[PDB]
Structures are given as C-alpha cells and as structure tokens.
Amino acid sequence: SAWGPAATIAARQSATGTKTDTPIQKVPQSISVVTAEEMALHQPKSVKEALSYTPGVSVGTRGASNTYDHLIIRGFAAEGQSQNNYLNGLKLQGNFYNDAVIDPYMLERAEIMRGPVSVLYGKSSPGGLLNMVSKRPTTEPLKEVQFKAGTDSLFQTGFDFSDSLDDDGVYSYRLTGLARSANAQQKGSEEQRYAIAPAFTWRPDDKTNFTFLSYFQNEPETGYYGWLPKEGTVEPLPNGKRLPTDFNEGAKNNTYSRNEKMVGYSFDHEFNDTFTVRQNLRFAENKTSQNSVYGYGVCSDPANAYSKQCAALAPADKGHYLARKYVVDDEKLQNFSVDTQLQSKFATGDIDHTLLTGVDFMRMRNDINAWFGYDDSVPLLNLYNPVNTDFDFNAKDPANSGPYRILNKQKQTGVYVQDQAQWDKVLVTLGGRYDWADQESLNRVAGTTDKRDDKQFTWRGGVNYLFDNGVTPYFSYSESFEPSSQVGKDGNIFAPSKGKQYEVGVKYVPEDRPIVVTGAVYNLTKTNNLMADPEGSFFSVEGGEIRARGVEIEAKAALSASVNVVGSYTYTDAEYTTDTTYKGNTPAQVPKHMASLWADYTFFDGPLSGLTLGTGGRYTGSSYGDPANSFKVGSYTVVDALVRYDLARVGMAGSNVALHVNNLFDREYVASCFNTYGCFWGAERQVVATATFRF
Amino acid sequence: SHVIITETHSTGLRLDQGAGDYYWSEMPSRVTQLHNNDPNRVVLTEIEFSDGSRHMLSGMSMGVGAKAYGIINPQIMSQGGLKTQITASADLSLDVGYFNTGTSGTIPQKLRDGTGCQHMFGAFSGRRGFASSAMYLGGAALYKSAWSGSGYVVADAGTLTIPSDYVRHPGARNFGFNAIYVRGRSCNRVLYGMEGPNYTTGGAVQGASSSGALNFTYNPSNPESPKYSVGFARADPTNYAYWESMGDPNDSANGPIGIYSEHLGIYPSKITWYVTNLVYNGSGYNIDSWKFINFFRDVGCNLSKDSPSTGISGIATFGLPTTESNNAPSIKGGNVGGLHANVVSIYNFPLRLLGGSGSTILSGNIVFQGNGSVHVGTVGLNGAIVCTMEFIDDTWLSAGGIGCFNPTEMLSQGAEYGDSRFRIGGNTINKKLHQILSLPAGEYVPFFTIKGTVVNACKLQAAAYNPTPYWVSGLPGSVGQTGYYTLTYYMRNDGNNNISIWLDSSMSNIIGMKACLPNIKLIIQRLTH
Ligand SMILES: CCCCCCCCCCCC(=O)O[C@H](CCCCCCCCCCC)CC(=O)N[C@H]1[C@H](OC[C@H]2O[C@H](OP(=O)([O-])[O-])[C@H](NC(=O)C[C@H](O)CCCCCCCCCC)[C@@H](OC(=O)C[C@@H](O)CCCCCCCCCCC)[C@@H]2O)O[C@H](CO[C@]2(C(=O)O)C[C@@H](O[C@]3(C(=O)O)C[C@@H](O)[C@@H](O)[C@@H]([C@H](O)CO)O3)[C@@H](O)[C@@H]([C@H](O)CO)O2)[C@@H](OP(=O)([O-])[O-])[C@@H]1OC(=O)CCOC(=O)CCCCCCCC
C-alpha cells in the first residue's frame, strides 16, 4: 500500500501551482498530482495514461498513438496541437513535430496544473500545463530492476539505481533507465524507446540541494502517428463494415524517430528562515526525423473534393478509397530554459507572506528540414483490400509537394512576483508576471523572416479560506497568454491569444483523514483566438474567442487500509463564443462529460496476502468530431484492471509481479477526431506482465 | 483571274471621346459590311502615319498580364490565384482592333465590347487544412487541361466555361464592329491583380468599365472543403481592372503593376481599306478607283528576319515595316534588330492566283525551356502569298505561355505537352484574319507575336507562407519575380513549296512555359504574275 499515503498524503504537497512547496489546499487553482507510487501502481505507457484519473484533462485523444503527450486540458490545447508540458518547472519547449516526451517510469511526480498559470510559467495554453518532476536521487540505496512483458510484443526492460556515494549522504546519485521495444497496435508500426536519466545530487547540508538532472532518450521508431477517416472508424464503411482497430494506412517504410538529450539541474539553497533561493535550468537537444504517410479521409471527403486520383474513381467507390498524404520531416531543437526564484518568507504583523520573486528565461531554436506531400501526393489506399507498399519519400514531386524548411526561434524572459499572504486562514495568493516573449522564424526555402516581440503581463489573484475541518473554498482569476505562430493578410504575426479564467471551487483536504476530494467550477475563455477570415480569404484573423465553463470533481480517498478510491469527473461546456465559421460550435475532441473511477483492494490478511486487484473504468462522453460539428464521436467506457502481487511474502521484499490489462473488455472505440479526415482508433486490450525487482 | 483592288475606302483617325492614344474612326459603311457581313472577302487594311509611313496589317498579336501565386502554410491554410489579361490586336506590332460605337463610354471604354479588350481571367482558390494544395485548384478550374502535373481535375460541368461569344478576337466577324482603333504602340499587357473573383462578395469587376463578366464561385458551407472561384471579364484596356475586394496593393512581394505597351514612336493618321477581289472559300481563294497589287504606292507588308531567334531575351518588340512617302521600305520602332521590311506595290490605271492552295492547322502544345525556335508546322503548296488565319477554335487567347496555359504545370519536371486551354465554350464566332504577306526565300516572316509581361507573385512576404515558384528557379525573399516572353510565329519560304512555321520564344526570368498553338487554320495561296 505504498500509494496509500502517497496519493492522499504525499500528493498533498505540490510546487506547480505556486512554484513554492505548499499543499494543494493552499493553491488557488485546480491542480492534480500523481506521485511515483501511483505511476508504479498503474504502470502507464505515457504521462497521459498516468493522468487518466485526474479531472479536466482528455488524455486519450490520440488513441493508440503514443508519439506525443498531447493533452486537451479543460478543452484547450497549445498552438497547433503542440505540447504544454513542463519537466522541472521548466517547459519542454517543443515546436512543430519536434516535441519532447518523458517516460512516466522516469518521473517521480507528474503535477498537472489546470487553468491559466502563465503568472509563473510564461506563455502557456489557457487550459493549463503538466509538470513532470524528475526522479531525484534518494539517500536510501534503491536498486530497482523492472521487466514489462506484454501483448503486442512489448518487451520493456528498465532499471532504477540510486545510492549515496558517501556515508553522510552529501553525494547521492540516481541512474534510472529503460529500454522498451513494442509493436504498435496498428499493424506494421513499431514503438522503440531507450531512455536514460543519470542524476547526481549534492547536499552540503539540509539547506542546499544542488541536484544535476539529465535525461537522454533515443526512440528509433516512435510508432503510429497517422490519421484515419471518420468513414470507416466512426461511421461504417459503405459495405457496412468498419476499419479494423489495427489499421495502419502508412507506407511499408514509415519511419518516426526521436532523440532527446536534456542536461540541467535543480538548485535549492536556503539562506535563512526568510530567504531561500531556487534555480532550475535545462538544455534539451531534441532531434526528430519522420517519414510518415498519413491518411486524409476517404475520397468522398469534402477536403478530397476533386483530388484527381479520387476523381478518376467510380462515384460509388469514392467513399472507401483513403486519399493520403506524406510528410518527410527532420528537425534539431536546441531548447534552453532558466528559472531562478527568490522566496522571501517574511511577516507583516499577523500576516505571513511568502513573496516569490523570480526571473525566468527560456530560449528555443528549432530548425526544420521538412517536405510536405500535399493533396494527391501518394496513391489512394483501398480500405476494402489495402496493400502496404514501400512508398519512396525521395521522389519529392514539386507538383503535389513542397518543402517546409524553417528555423523557428523562440525566446522569453519573465519577471514575476507572487505573494501568498496568509492571515488567519484567508490565504490571498496574488501574483503577476511580465513576459518579454520574442519569436523569430526564418523560412529557409524563400529567405524571409518574421519577428514578433510580445510584452504581455499576466496576473492571478486567488483567495483560499482554509477551514479547520479541512474544506478550503477558493476563488481565483488567473490570466494567461500564448503568442500565435501565424501571420495575417499583412504578413505580421498576430497578437497573443490571451486566456482568462474565473475558477471557484473547494478542496476538502483534511489534515487527519486521507481524502483529497477537490471540486472546481471555472469560466475559462481564450480571447484573441485565430479564426477564418470573415472576407473571402483563407488567412487567419484575431478576434476569435473560445469559452469553456466546466465543473470538475476529483476524489482521492483511502477509505480503508486496503481500499484506495481515486476517481474524477469533468463536465466541460467548451464553445466558440466568437468565431466566423464555428460560432456556437463546440471544439473537436472535447467531450462534454468525462468521468473516471479507480478502486484497488490490497489484500493483507489471509492466504492471498499481497494481491492488489484494482479495477478502474475511465468514461469519456460523446465529443464532436470536427469544429464544424458535422458528426459526434461516440462515448466509450474503457475498463483497466490490475493484478499486482508483491514478492515480500515469497521473500524478495519490495519486488512485485503485476499484470495490467488496459481496456479489459477490448472495446473497439474511436478515441477522438479533430476533423472528418483525422480519426484515431482507441487502444485495444493490452496485458502487461510487470515484475519490478528491488535487487 | 488577277488579284486587283476593286474598292479603296480611306478615312482619318480621330482622337475625341477620351481616346488619348487610341486613334479611332468609324469604318465606312461598305468597309463595315465587308468586315462583318462579308467576312470571306480579303480586304487589306493600310495604316498611314503622321510621318507619311504606310503599313499594311499582317498577322495577329497578343499581350498577357499573368500573375500567379501559390502561398501555403502546411499547418494552417493554402491559397492560390491566377489573374491573366489577354489583349490582342489585328496587326503584328500595331494595336489595331475593332469596336462598336454604340457602346456607351469613352473610346477605351467602348473597347470593352470590341476587340483589343483585356480578356481578364481569374482563379482564386484555397483551403484551410493541413498540407492542402488547394492553391492549385484555381489552375484546375480555370484551365481545361487534360493533365500535365499533379493535383485536381475540375469537370467542365462544374467550373466556368466562357462562351465564345463573350471573348472578342481581332478579326471576329460575327460581331457588329463599325469602328476601328489603331494605336502606335503594341497590345496592352495590362498587368494588375493576382486573384480571381472573391467569394463572399458580389464578384463585380471594380476598377474599369468591364463587360461580359462571368463568375463561378465555389463556396460550400463546409469549412473543410477547398473553396475556389473563376472569373472572366472584358474591361478597359488602358485601366487597371480587378475583381471586388481583390485589388493589387503593389507590394514588393507581388511584382509591379502597369499597362505595358511598347511604343513604336509612330502616330497613325489615316486608314485605307483595299478591297481586293480575293474571296476566301475555306481551302484557298477564288477570284470574284481600280488598283492592282504588285510586288506607285509602296506599302510596307511584313518583316523578314534571317533567323527566328530574336536574341533579345525578354519583350522582343518587332519594328513596324513601314514605308516613307518616297517609296522606300523602312522599319519604325521595335526592339528586335536585323529585320528586313517587304513592301507591296499598289497602283491605279497584275499578279494572278497560282493554282494550288496549302492549308494547315497549327495544333499542339509546344513546351519551351528557354529561348529557342522550333518547327511547329508546315504548309503544303517568288514569295508573294495571301494568308488567312482562320481560328476554328477559341484557343487564340490560350496561345502564349505562363498564365495562359496552366501556371501550375511548370512544377512537373518533364515534358508536359498537355492540352491546357482557357475553358472557352464552343466556337460560335467567325474569327478570320486576311493578310497579304511577302515571304522571301529562306527568311522568316513573323505573323503572330504573344509578348507577355508576367509576375510570379508571392502575396505575402512572410516566413510562415511559402510561395510556390511556378516558372522561376525560386522566390528568394518572397518577392514577385517579373518575367517577360515574346512567343513569335514565323512563316518561312523553304523554296520547295513548303511554308514552314517556326515558333520562337524569348524569355526573361522565366525558366520555361507551354505555348499552346492557337489552332490556326493557316491558309496560304501563292500569287505571282
Ligand atoms: C556550474 C553551474 C551550471 C552553470 C550553467 C551555465 C550555462 C548558461 C548558458 C546560457 C547561454 C546558452 O543558451 O547556451 C546555449 C546552451 C549551452 C549549454 C548550457 C549548459 C547546459 C547544462 C548546464 C550544466 C548542468 C549541470 C548554447 C547553444 O544552444 N548552442 C547551440 C547552437 O545554437 C544556439 C546559438 O545561438 C544562440 O543565440 P541565437 O543566435 O540563436 O539568438 C546562443 N546565444 C544565447 O543563448 C544568448 C542568450 O539569449 C543570453 C541569455 C543567457 C542566459 C544565461 C543565464 C543563466 C546562467 C546560469 C548560472 C549561442 O550561444 C552562445 O553564443 C555561446 C554561449 O551562450 C554558450 C557558452 C556557455 C555554455 C556552454 C558550457 C556549459 C556550462 C558548463 C557545464 C559543465 C549559440 O551559439 O547551435 C549549434 C549548432 O550550430 C549549427 C551547426 O552548424 O549545426 C550552425 C548554426 O549556424 C550559425 C549560427 O547561427 O550559429 C550561423 C552560420 O552562418 C555559421 O556561422 C555557423 C557557424 O559555422 C558555426 O560556428 O553558425 C545553425 O545553423 C544551427 C542550426 O540552428 C541547428 O539547430 O546549427 C549547437 O551545436 P550542436 O547541436 O551541433 O552540437 C549548439 O548546441 C551545443 O553547443 C550545446 C552542447 O551542449 C552541451 O555542451 C551541454 C554540456 C553540459 C554539461 C554536461 C553535464 C556535466 C556533468
């Protein structure tokens, strides 16, 4: 029952909402954290599946794809389906297809922060961010080796070694790594990942903690990142059947690689009881190279209206020939982030202030050598009898394809002041942040460059009344901004898409019972969103606004010494309040109702002492398949089981042999669709026999 | 049966009604009847200038103002646009055309319903999708190409098919043309605008006195469908004409704008129609105050270049083969050099139609990749001939490359040779151009020039959107790459009764084009005493 006092007690402390070590009851926003114990219990494939039982986040939008940790938090994502993940309070600043992904096995805590939190993290999506704290070295010698053998030829070998070099524990290290090799659900696609995170910690005393954090990951084959039509996944094919859940529409030589080399540290130093400084930095050199042929809806799709290959087909056969497109991408992203904070814990009479003043600098340079295959660039796939053929990518025909070579430079310096004034029980968390966000982009095909330097100020004022019994009602208005990467009819980059949120809720976090029940009702609006041109042009325009009012209830409660219920619920009324073509429509891949419930019973007495039979069922409501709301993806209820039995009874203390069955009922469900041409099948039933030995 | 001139009607050339440069005059009633109600009668038009220079109309001419762009962001959208402006004249280097005085407006405005009118063609397409190539949908919709590159096909039943009665052609005889305008410059290659009609607008042509406006706006309510539009309009040849809300803001990323017409320096003052007794039957000619044609009024007839290669690499204007008022051949204006002027001999008080007439149809789509001539046809029959350029198909305005065939086929890396027209429906218009031509043995006599000033527009000078380089090696800095070409058709006398047809192109900043031969039913009858 390691996760017992870890999901309800050790999960109470969080440093994402306020960038200072405060309990979640003292954070005036919806923040959910999952400790490494929950990560080990659920054994998620990515951080998304780790955040399955947290409200406000749609983690299964891409289905069986595990390429990126793309989360639609509160109905909002980043610019152009980008990632908004922070690792050690520092953003995994990825651009275009070059997005950083950290294995959940290689993290000690994933704190998802919901709502505008740009007051501390610079530019961010209005939905929120995800903070995945690394596995810092432990002073207690831990030598863990884990083997994950499961379906789809998943053979993951991992290890996690940490020990104190000297007797006093001044020098402690942690060399954690893994080597997974699995075939994707889609027939033909394989997913390989080789991640290593050597970490070194230096502790002169109990005041200073300089831990060097690195993370090197190599993915020779990321997996499947293609699109499928709504005509075959959601709607039946014209013959009445549906596309199989293991359908890969890519070429026989589809390639998708990623390589992350992150080197940094997390420096903590406490001068006195009233002045403690912190500093996190990390340089990440991410490289991705992909040769992907992705489907673009069947030939009857509006998008493939003429599409000569589609036109040459018989009118009755245009409804089941999948017109596809190819992309040949090669990147090298050099990200650098610095976040220096000075936490001044002082008092003014009765009030006790925690004045966090800091400077945050993030610099990302991302060159892109990509070639895009436009409409009618690859042969159509006959969904009735598909044939996988080696589509060569060097034959870059300029008639139906065009280069996309660009050097995306992004820089941001942020000075923020945050004051957590606590008087009696009225904790007033008032913050503000001035961001000097600069962005360049050099189109190397032509030679043009466009630059935009944004100076956006975002603030968050929250008031929490920490009642003695445990329920702490809170209300907070928090701002966010996220500069656009698009240019208008004038060739100038747009103003940042600012995000405002008025969130009211309670956090029942008693100091005696192990229950972390949390509620929240928010009115999150993303102003200055980019919409289609009112006139007859295909450019973008400012003035768009997406407003999402939602109610989120989270319940993490250890009912008994054995039972551990970790549930959630999310009602999300996202809507384009102001738009030209989608006014009144609900955004795609945003289900109105999301619910989840995880209950695990840990046997402790009797012949079965050690078992952890836990069954959890995540429900996702019906979501619109396109922004035009032409069709709705059906609602599905996936059930994940877990049969974990520790080997302490056998004799190997700490070692546990588990059996995780994701989607226990093998439900064939379409996870989500962002348009009629792009749909993602859900992951099928997957058993994973995990045996983590504390050798 | 000798070739004689039965009637000769002369007139001045007025400049009133706001003509400015279009020296115009109502044709005599007899000349109007013989030009409209009796098309098959070979009447020779002779222009007399203020310097005493005399020139006979011989051969067609053309001028295009094409402007194309292909901007695309692979994550956001894709946009295309093709605005051409075809202006044609009834003389090889002069701007000679016919118009109806009944049309309201100034003399250039009267040209909106006559020949020498900038037949503008527009195709604005696009889509907001991932890796969309809807930039090339305008080319598919506007141009009826079998296929040459890769992209979309738009069926004729869907897109706009301009009726052949809506496109005026110098030498169109089914129309009512009672006045003629002659300008000392060449055809107006009015270069303006980059996009067709704008959807979500009325589609009206704002900017010039347009006429015959045809639009096909494909604007489905589905936001994920490639929207496009096709527009055609006959507008003022001397004024910038554009569709509503689709003007040209003259950025560096869009090339220049202007009504280009290379002046020859001469100013017309008199027009004389020599009504010969040559009646054109369809496969030659038959013989039906009294002047005779010989090879003593010496009138400049045509040019005779030694080699088709003008060697100008750009707009290669041919000087007008005039004749001073002292019976001496000369050449006035022009950029090309080395031309020899040939003169007919008209006198009043006897060459005769030689038996056997050769006729050919200049059909095909010759793909060019640089300055260089090519043998595009042959005629199966001294070098004195009478020629009629009968256009059996309305593809004359599709003749000439870059913006006249499909400015999205240049992307393909192979010999296209695709039948890429302008989608002009039917041929219910009589298009005839009678002309007497002297063809010296071995020398090349031009009879059709397609001088064209084009710009490979870039719309946006932004790094987000990559402009498609159609007929250029690239678009550095996303600036519009202005191009020029002078596709010229030469008629040479081989000496073995074979009148070979040679087409010479003179590009500048253009990697190549496809020049659709304008289906000319070239009919030659050699005459010599
Ligand atoms: C002791 C306590 C810690 C104390 C820690 C203190 C650190 C503070 C550092 C802050 C400054 C910074 O951010 O430092 C970064 C990261 C370095 C690592 C940091 C430590 C990590 C980990 C820290 C330690 C953890 C414990 C440098 C970088 O990122 N460099 C990458 C570079 O791109 C960025 C460049 O532009 C930017 O400005 P821009 O122009 O873009 O605006 C930068 N200016 C800034 O930031 C200013 C900033 O805003 C001011 C604010 C500062 C805030 C500080 C506060 C905070 C202070 C905190 C206290 C500029 O930096 C500098 O100017 C130097 C200085 O700043 C760094 C020195 C100190 C750090 C190192 C010691 C390390 C420290 C000692 C550690 C032992 C830089 O040069 O591209 C190279 C490739 O170039 C080409 C190639 O040909 O392919 C050609 C190129 O073309 C061109 C061309 O464009 O260049 C043009 C052509 O015409 C032609 O001329 C052509 C020519 O032919 C070519 O010569 O060049 C182009 O085409 C690209 C293409 O784009 C491909 O993408 O490709 C890459 O090579 P690659 O990828 O091929 O290998 C390279 O990556 C590699 O070097 C990185 C290698 O990692 C490893 O070593 C890490 C080892 C760590 C130890 C390991 C663990 C130990 C146990």
- CATH number of the domain where residue A483 is located: 2.40.170.20
Least Cα separation, residue B420 to chain A (angstroms):
16
Residue A3 lies in a domain: no
DSSP letter, residue A108: E
Mutate to test the pocket of ligand 1, among A173, A175, A281, A341 (most ligand atoms within 8 A of CB): A281
Residue A2 lies in a domain: no
Taking contacts as CB-CB distances below 8 angstroms, the residues of chain A near B128 are 532, 538
CA A607 – CA A687 distance, rounded (Å): 25
φ and ψ of A40, to 5 deg: -70, -35
- Residue A513 is labelled as binding a ligand: no
Chain centroid to Cα B139, Å, comes to: 20
Would an 8 Å CB–CB cutoff place A367 in contact with chain B?
A: no
φ and ψ of A311, to 5 deg: -65, -40
Give the chain B residue nearest A327 (alpha carbons): B131
Task: Name the residue facing B222 among A302, A449, A582 (closest C-beta).
Answer: A302
Least Cα separation, residue A182 to chain B (angstroms):
29
Sheet of strand B179-183, all strands in order from the earlier edge strand to the far edge: B23-26, B179-183, B95-99
In total, how many domains does chain B have?
1
Residue B86: which of B200, B233, B248, B221 has the closest Cα?
B233
d(CA A265, ligand 1 centre) in Å: 16
Residue B449: which of B88, B183, B61, B57 has the closest Cα?
B61
Contact map slice: A 237-256 vs B, CB within 8 A: none
Contact A598, A616 (CB under 8 A): yes
Q: What are the helix and strand counts (H, E) for chain A?
A: 5, 36
Which residue, among B466, B468, B471, B514, would best test binding to A if mutated, counting the most A CBs under 10 Å from its CB? B466
Contact map slice: B 365-384 vs A, CB within 8 A: none
Run of H or E including B482: strand B481-485
Single-letter amino acid, residue A559:
L
Residue A115, sorted as left (phi over 0), alpha (psi -120 to 50) or beta, turns out to be left
Query: Rounded to a whole number, what is the largest CA-CA distance in chain B?
Result: 79
CA A508 – CA A519 distance, rounded (Å): 8
Taking contacts as CB-CB distances below 8 angstroms, the residues of chain B near A311 are 152-153, 155
Neighbours of A244 (CB within 10 A): 17
Pairwise CB contact (< 8 Å): B151 & A375 = yes
Chain centroid to Cα B33, Å, comes to: 25
| Residue A267 CA, closest ligand 1 atom number | 2
Paired tokens of A36: 């490494």
Q: In Å, what is the CA distance from A297 to each residue of A168, A324, A417, B367?
A: 62, 7, 49, 36
Taking contacts as CB-CB distances below 8 angstroms, the residues of chain B near A538 are 77-79, 126-128, 134, 227
Neighbours of A384 (CB within 10 A): 12
Residue A294 half-sphere exposure, CB side, CA atoms within 13 Å?
23
Paired tokens of B524: 């030659």
Residue B406: which of B141, B18, B182 has the closest Cα?
B141
Residue A435 lies in a domain: yes
Residue A631: which of A593, A595, A669, A585 has the closest Cα?
A585
DSSP state letters, A382-398: ESSS-------SS---T
CA A642 – CA B238 distance, rounded (Å): 81
Contact A543, A535 (CB under 8 A): no
CA A100 – CA A216 distance, rounded (Å): 11
Radius of gyration, alpha carbons of chain B: 22
Dihedral Cα B422, B423, B427, B430, nearest 10 deg: -30
| C-alpha triplet A631, A636, A641: angle, nearest 5° | 160
Residue B490: which of B529, B442, B458 has the closest Cα?
B442
Neighbours of B124 (CB within 10 A): 31
CA A139 – CA A158 distance, rounded (Å): 21
Paired tokens of B246: 């689709």
CA A124 – CA A144 distance, rounded (Å): 36
Q: In Å, what is the CA distance from B236 to each residue of A230, B107, B117, B194?
A: 50, 10, 7, 17
CA B153 – CA B218 distance, rounded (Å): 14
Residue A485 lies in a domain: yes
Measuring from each residue's beta carbon to the nearest atom of ligand 1, which residues come in under 6 Å?
A 212, 263-265, 281, 283, 285, 332, 334, 336, 338, 361, 363, 365, 367, 407, 409
CA A453 – CA B53 distance, rounded (Å): 65
d(CA A434, ligand 1 centre) in Å: 25
Coil, helix or strand at residue A119: helix
Single-letter amino acid, residue A2:
A
Mutate to test the pocket of ligand 1, among A95, A363, A440 (most ligand atoms within 8 A of CB): A363
Paired tokens of B176: 């009512």
| Residue A263 CA, closest ligand 1 atom number | 22
CA B144 – CA B165 distance, rounded (Å): 18
Taking contacts as CB-CB distances below 8 angstroms, the residues of chain B near A628 are 222-224
CA A564 – CA A558 distance, rounded (Å): 4
Paired tokens of A673: 């669709």
Pairing of strands B227-235, B211-218: antiparallel
Residue A438 lies in a domain: yes
Contact B506, B314 (CB under 8 A): yes
Contact A288, A266 (CB under 8 A): no
Would an 8 Å CB–CB cutoff place B411 in contact with chain A?
A: yes
DSSP letter, residue B14: B
Paired tokens of A138: 């432990």
Contact A556, A37 (CB under 8 A): no
B316: CB partners within 8 A, 6+ apart: B310, B335, B336, B451, B486, B488, B506
Give the chain A residue nearest B73 (alpha carbons): A404
Which residue, among A329, A448, A493, would best test binding to B if mutated, counting the most B CBs under 10 Å from its CB? A448
Residue A405: which of A371, A357, A456 has the closest Cα?
A371
CA B34 – CA B48 distance, rounded (Å): 21
For the four alpha carbons of B398, B401, B404 and B409, in that order, the dihedral sign comes to positive
d(CA A538, ligand 1 centre) in Å: 38
Residue with tokens 């020398």: B443
Residue with tokens 């046997």: A603
Pairing of strands A190-202, A208-219: antiparallel
3-state secondary structure B303-344: EEECCCCCCCCCCCCCCECCECCCCCECCECCCCCCCEEEEE
Breaks in chain A listed by the residue before each, with C–N > 2.5 Å? none
Tallying the residues shown for chain A, one arrives at 695
DSSP letter, residue B112: G
The CA-to-CA distance between both ends of chain A, in Å, stands at 20
Single-letter amino acid, residue A606:
G
Taking contacts as CB-CB distances below 8 angstroms, the residues of chain A near B413 are 397-398
Contact A78, A96 (CB under 8 A): no
Pairwise CB contact (< 8 Å): A446 & B129 = no
Give the chain A residue nearest B251 (alpha carbons): A490
Residue B524: which of B382, B380, B350 has the closest Cα?
B380
Pairwise CB contact (< 8 Å): A536 & B245 = yes
- Residue A494 is labelled as binding a ligand: no
d(CA A336, ligand 1 centre) in Å: 8
Residue B482: which of B210, B318, B213, B260 has the closest Cα?
B260
Query: Rounded to a whole number, what is the largest CA-CA distance in chain A?
Result: 83
Paired tokens of B69: 């762009």
Domain of residue A517 covers: 13-693
Chain centroid to Cα B516, Å, comes to: 12
Burial of B425 (0-12, 13-18, 19+ CB in 10 A): middle
In total, how many domains does chain A have?
1
Would an 8 Å CB–CB cutoff place B133 in contact with chain A?
A: yes
- Residue A634 is labelled as binding a ligand: no
Breaks in chain B listed by the residue before each, with C–N > 2.5 Å? 288, 295, 349, 381
Burial of B350 (0-12, 13-18, 19+ CB in 10 A): exposed
Coil, helix or strand at residue A646: strand
Single-letter amino acid, residue A275:
F
Burial of A189 (0-12, 13-18, 19+ CB in 10 A): buried
Would an 8 Å CB–CB cutoff place B280 in contact with chain A?
A: no
Task: Name the residue facing B466 among A296, A446, A630 (closest C-beta).
Answer: A446
Residue A28: which of A461, A388, A614 has the closest Cα?
A461
Pairing of strands B41-49, B268-280: antiparallel
Contact B141, B232 (CB under 8 A): no
Residue A6 lies in a domain: no
Neighbours of B224 (CB within 10 A): 22
Contact A333, A94 (CB under 8 A): yes
Expressed in percent and rounded to 5, the helix, strand and coil fractions of chain B are 5, 45, 50
DSSP state letters, B342-390: EEEEEEE---BEEEEEEEEEE--EEEE-SSEEEEEE--B---EEEEEEE
Alpha helices (runs of H) in A375-534, residue ranges in sequence order: none
d(CA A435, ligand 1 centre) in Å: 22
Residue B318: which of B54, B113, B62, B497 has the closest Cα?
B62
Q: Whose CA is nearest to atom 37 of ligand 1?
A: A365
Q: What is the resolution of this structure in A?
A: 3.1
φ and ψ of B276, to 5 deg: -70, 160
Run of H or E including B174: none
Contact B365, B396 (CB under 8 A): no
Residue with tokens 């939602």: A550
Would an 8 Å CB–CB cutoff place B255 in contact with chain A?
A: no
φ and ψ of B30, to 5 deg: -65, -45
CA A18 – CA A22 distance, rounded (Å): 7
Q: Whose CA is nearest to atom 83 of ligand 1?
A: A334
Least Cα separation, residue B364 to chain A (angstroms):
22
Neighbours of B155 (CB within 10 A): 11
Alpha helices (runs of H) in A554-662, residue ranges in sequence order: none
Pairwise CB contact (< 8 Å): B226 & A306 = yes
Burial of A663 (0-12, 13-18, 19+ CB in 10 A): buried
CA B314 – CA A364 distance, rounded (Å): 46
CA A124 – CA A290 distance, rounded (Å): 26
Pairwise CB contact (< 8 Å): A372 & B128 = no
CA B265 – CA B127 distance, rounded (Å): 48
Pairing of strands A85-86, A128-134: parallel
Chain centroid to Cα A364, Å, comes to: 19
Domain of residue B52 covers: 4-527
A424: CB partners within 8 A, 6+ apart: A350
Paired tokens of A278: 């912190």
d(CA A334, ligand 1 centre) in Å: 8
DSSP letter, residue A240: S
Q: In Å, what is the CA distance from A576 to each residue of A71, A495, A528, A532, B412?
A: 19, 18, 12, 13, 42
B312-342 per-residue burial string, b: 16 or more CB within 10 A, e: under 16: bbbbbbbbbbbbbeeeebbbbbbbbeebbbb
